[PDB]
Structures are given as structure tokens and as C-alpha cells.
């Protein structure tokens, strides 16, 4: 299983660690952080200029472009690493691809006006993530009759929507969207049944690093969640998840080697 973008490819025969690069001189530092994550073994950098917590500011198109595009460019020029852009805005999707972005990672699965068309035109890989509602309201009272079945249904419909716009199935990644309109119970149901999403024959991407599903279980703050984050990452990668989105790259990469050695022997 492979992905293709910007003339290169990503070989998904082993788990990949995707390092988080938040962009909120800013440019000097982002590049430094990207370099460390690459030295620690990250094969993808996820660049994002808009926060997804409920009180977060709606960032304007011009503010998001100013923060994200120079970082994406500066990485594609310096390094061989793949670049994921964490945006919902067609303009950022377009401008990101023009300066070397390899993956469109949209928490809203191209629901914004023009995002679907913009993504198709780039020809890049697209991640389709599940969220109930939207970031400012999704955690109030998340509800499912059956959370696995409903996330599954959502992937069926969104793959179809992507194909209808000329985005081939082979471009797509799927992500159950841990913490995106889900309580503690919902998150763990999804993680326990993650391997069952393989029936789509598509790369699974997961993001659980330092999240509330760990925080509520250990009753600790974000800085104290590493062990819980590694446990999540290992549980996911053992079930065949292809890309793991994390803050702590060195440690996750180390844990992924142990998983890979275990999977190779199986
Ligand atoms: C951009 N993005 C995010 S941002 C939220 C976050 O990191 N929260 C958070 C960070 C630190 C502490 C607590 C919560 N989560 C995902 C995900 O799970 N999947 C994909 N594909 N993209 C994603």
C-alpha cells in the first residue's frame, strides 16, 4: 500500500509517525521544530494554523495563509519529508499544493464550500476524518446509537462523495477522529474496533496524542500524558493503523519499531 504526491511516494508497509507542527520569528522556529521531528524519525509533518478546541478563534483565510504557506514551502525546500496540511479552506488547500504539500488533512472532510473541488484539482491524497457536529459544540453532548456503525456509515458516504468529484479511492485516507464529538466511552469503542475499518482497503490515520480520552482516564494534564499516548499509538498500530499523529515523535517512533518487529514476526 502506497501514496503518491509531488513526484515521490510514501510506502505504508510499516507505521509512519506524523509529527504535529502548530503555527500559532515564527518561521525560524517552525523550521527548527520540523528538523528535530525529522531527526527523531517523523516521516510526515502536519502543519496547522487553526486550533480545534471549542473557544478557538475562527482564523481568517488571510491569517491562515500567512502562517501556513511559508512553513510548508520552507519545509519542502529544505527536507525530503512529506507534508500534511491541516486546513479546511480551499485557498489554503490550493496554495499549499503549489508550494509542495503532499496530503490534505481536513478535520471537516472537505465540507466547506469549494474545498471538495479545490482538493480534487490538486490531485493530492486526502484524509477523511469523522466529526459529529463542529469544533465549538461537538463535545457538549455527543450521542450515538452505535458509534462504530455510524462512523463506518460516514466513511461509506464520504468516499462516494469524494469519488463523485473525481477524487479516486486510492487518494483517500480514513480517520475515526478521536475526540471529535465523542465521549470517553465512544473513543474507546472506536479504538477497540479500529481494525474493522480495514475493510475499505484504505490507509487508516489516527490522532490520539495527549488527548482528553487519555486525560480523563489518568486524571492528569496534557504534559503528563505521554505513557497513555504511547499506549494509544501502540494499540492502533498493532491493529494495522498506517499513520499515527503525535506530539512526541522520538518516543512514538521507538514504540513503532517494537510494533513493527512484532508485526513482522506474526
Ligand atoms: C488536526 N487534527 C487534530 S487537532 C486536535 C488535537 O490535536 N487536540 C489536542 C491536542 C493536545 C491536547 C489535547 C487535544 N486532531 C486530529 C486527528 O485526530 N486526526 C487528524 N487527521 N487531524 C487531526
Curated annotation (Swiss-Prot):
Binding annotation for (7,8-dihydropterin-6-yl)methyl diphosphate: 52, 86, 105, 175, 211, 245-247
Question: So which domain of life are we looking at?
Answer: Bacteria
Q: Does the keyword Hydrolase apply?
A: no
InterPro entries recorded for this chain?
DHP_synth-like, DHP_synth_dom, Dihydropteroate_synth-like_sf, Pterin-binding_dom
The record's Gene Ontology biological-process terms are: folic acid biosynthetic process; tetrahydrofolate biosynthetic process
Which terms in the GO cellular component ontology are assigned? cytosol
The protein here is known as Dihydropteroate synthase
Query: Which organism's genome codes for this protein?
Result: Escherichia coli O6:H1 (strain CFT073 / ATCC 700928 / UPEC)
Organism phylogeny: Bacteria, Pseudomonadati, Pseudomonadota, Gammaproteobacteria, Enterobacterales
